C-alpha cells in the first residue's frame, strides 16, 4: 500500500493550490486520508482529513480556505486551498495517519512554493581541484548549482552510474534564488583518467545541464 | 487541542537514554490515541509507536512509549547515531470536532566519536567570472562536533557574502559535512590574490588556501 501526492510547484500569491493524493493497495472507502504540511525547517501541521464517511474536518486555521474531497472510484483525495500566501510555502504530505490503529502510510511529500518571484534556471559550474594539485590519496570533485528557483533540482553523477562517495548539500535560499553543491570523492588513480560528469535537472524550468569535470 | 513537547532539542551521547515528554491540553481519544514519529530531513515521518506504547513493525526495542490521557513519554534506551532525527508526538481528539494535532518536535543530536574535519577549497570555474560574480566553495568533510568557517581574502577576514549548508548527521558515525560558499563580484575576485577557508573545531583550526592565477 502507498499514497502519492501530485506535483506541487510554484504558485503566485492569491492563487489556489490543488493537490491530489492517489491511493494504491488499500481501500479508500474505509481509510481516512489526512493532509499535513511542513514549512521549510519547521514542524508538522495537520491541515484536515476526509473521514471514512467521505466527510471532511479541518484544523480551525484551515477551515475557511481548505476543501478536502475524496473520489472512491478514482482512489483519489483532493486538497484545495484558496488565497495562498508565502505562509503556505511548505512540503505537503497526504497520509493515512495511524495514531491509535495499526494501519499507517505516508506519502513522500511534494514541495509547494508561494512567491511572486520568477522561475529561474540554474547556472551550473564545475568544481575541480586547485590548479596542478596532486595532494592526497583521494580526489574530490564538485558541481555548483547556482541561482535557481523554485526548488528542487535533481543531481546525478555519470547519469547515476557514479553513486558511491557522493554528498549533495541542502540548498541555501537567498534573495529568491537557491544555490546547491554536490561533491564526489574518488581515488587519485580514478580521475582525471576516468570521465566524471554531473547531470543537473531543474523540472520547474524544464532545463538540464551536463557538466564534465576537467582539470584546470 | 495543544500538544506541548519538551524539550525542543537535546544533544545526547551514544548509549545514553533520551526522554521526550508530550503534554496534551485535553485528553486524547480513549486516553491512548497518541503516537510517536521519527523524521529525518527530506523524508516523511516514520511511525515508531502508536496507541501510546505499541511498537511499529521492525522498530528497535530501545524505543518505548508510556503515558495516558494528557501526559506521554517517549524513551530511547541506548541511543545510536541512527536515531539522530526530529521526533513528534501526534494525538487524536474527537470533540468538539475530530482533529489530529502534532507536538512541536524534539530535535535529537547524537554525539558520536569526535573527528576533526578535512578541508577542501574550490576556486571558481573559469566561466563564472564573465557573469559578474564568482562563488568560491569550501567543504569540511566528516567531522564532529560542529565547526565554524572563516573566510580570509589576502589575509583579511571576510564577513559578507558567505552561505553555509550542513548535511544531516551520518546515520552510522554521527559525522557532518559542510559546504561554505563565498560570493564576490568579479571585480573583487580579480583584485585579490589569496583565498583562504579556515575551519575551526573547538581550539583546532584547519586551513586550506589557493592563489588566483
Amino acid at each position: 500500500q502507498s499514497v502519492e501526492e501530485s506535483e506541487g510547484g510554484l504558485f503566485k500569491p492569491t492563487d489556489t493550490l490543488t493537490l491530489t493524493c492517489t491511493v494504491s493497495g488499500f481501500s479508500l472507502s474505509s481509510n481516512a486520508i489526512s493532509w499535513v504540511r511542513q514549512a521549510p525547517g519547521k514542524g508538522l501541521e495537520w491541515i484536515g482529513f476526509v473521514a471514512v464517511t467521505g466527510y471532511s474536518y479541518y484544523a480551525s486555521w484551515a477551515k475557511s480556505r481548505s476543501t478536502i474531497t475524496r473520489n472512491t472510484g478514482l482512489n483519489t483525495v483532493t486538497l484545495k486551498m484558496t488565497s495562498l500566501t508565502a505562509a503556505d510555502t511548505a512540503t505537503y504530505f497526504c497520509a493515512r495517519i495511524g495514531i491509535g490503529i495499526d494501519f499507517n502510510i505516508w506519502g513522500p511529500g511534494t514541495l509547494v512554493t508561494v512567491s511572486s518571484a520568477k522561475t529561474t534556471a540554474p547556472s551550473v559550474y564545475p568544481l575541480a581541484p586547485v590548479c596542478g594539485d596532486t595532494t592526497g590519496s583521494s580526489v574530490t570533485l564538485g558541481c555548483l548549482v547556482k541561482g535557481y528557483f523554485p526548488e528542487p533540482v535533481t543531481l546525478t553523477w555519470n547519469s547515476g552510474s557514479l553513486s558511491s562517495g557522493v554528498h549533495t548539500f541542502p540548498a541555501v535560499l537567498q534573495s529568491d534564488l537557491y544555490t546547491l553543491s554536490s561533491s564526489v570523492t574518488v581515488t587519485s588513480s580514478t580521475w582525471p583518467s576516468q570521465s566524471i560528469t554531473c547531470n543537473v535537472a531543474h523540472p520547474a524550468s524544464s532545463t538540464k545541464v551536463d557538466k564534465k569535470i576537467e582539470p584546470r | 487541542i495543544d500538544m506541548t513537547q519538551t524539550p525542543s532539542s537535546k544533544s545526547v551521547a551514544v548509549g545514553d537514554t533520551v526522554t521526550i515528554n508530550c503534554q496534551a491540553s485535553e485528553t486524547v481519544y480513549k486516553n491512548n490515541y497518541l503516537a510517536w514519529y521519527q523524521q529525518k530531513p527530506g523524508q516523511p515521518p516514520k511511525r515508531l509507536i502508536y496507541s501510546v506504547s505499541t511498537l511499529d513493525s521492525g522498530v528497535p526495542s530501545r524505543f518505548s512509549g508510556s503515558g495516558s490521557g494528557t501526559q506521554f513519554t517517549l524513551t530511547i534506551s541506548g541511543v545510536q547515531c541512527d536515531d539522530a532525527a526530529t521526533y513528534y508526538c501526534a494525538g487524536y481528539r474527537t470533540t468538539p470536532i475530530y482533529h489530529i494535532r502534532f507536538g512541536g518536535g524534539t530535535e535529537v543530536v547524537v554525539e558520536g566519536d569526535p573527528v576533526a574535519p578535512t578541508v577542501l577549497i574550490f576556486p571558481p570555474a573559469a566561466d563564472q567570472v564573465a557573469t559578474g560574480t564568482v562563488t568560491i566553495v569550501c567543504v569540511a568533510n566528516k567531522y564532529f562536533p560542529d565547526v565554524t568557517v572563516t573566510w580570509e581574502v589576502d589575509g583579511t577576514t571576510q564577513t559578507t557574502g558567505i552561505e553555509n549548508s550542513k548535511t544531516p548527521q551520518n546515520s552510522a558515525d554521527c559525522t557532518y559535512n559542510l559546504s561554505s560558499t563565498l560570493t564576490l563580484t568579479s571585480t573583487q575576485y580579480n583584485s585579490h590574490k589569496e583565498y583562504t577557508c579556515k575551519v575551526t573545531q573547538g581550539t583546532t583550526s584547519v586551513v586550506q588556501s589557493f592563489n588566483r592565477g
Binding site: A51, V52 | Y33, T94
Partner: peptide
C-alpha cells in the same frame, strides 16, 4: 482516527 467515532 477515522472521523466517525462516537466521541
Amino acid at each position: 482516527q477515522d472521523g466517525n467515532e462516537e466521541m
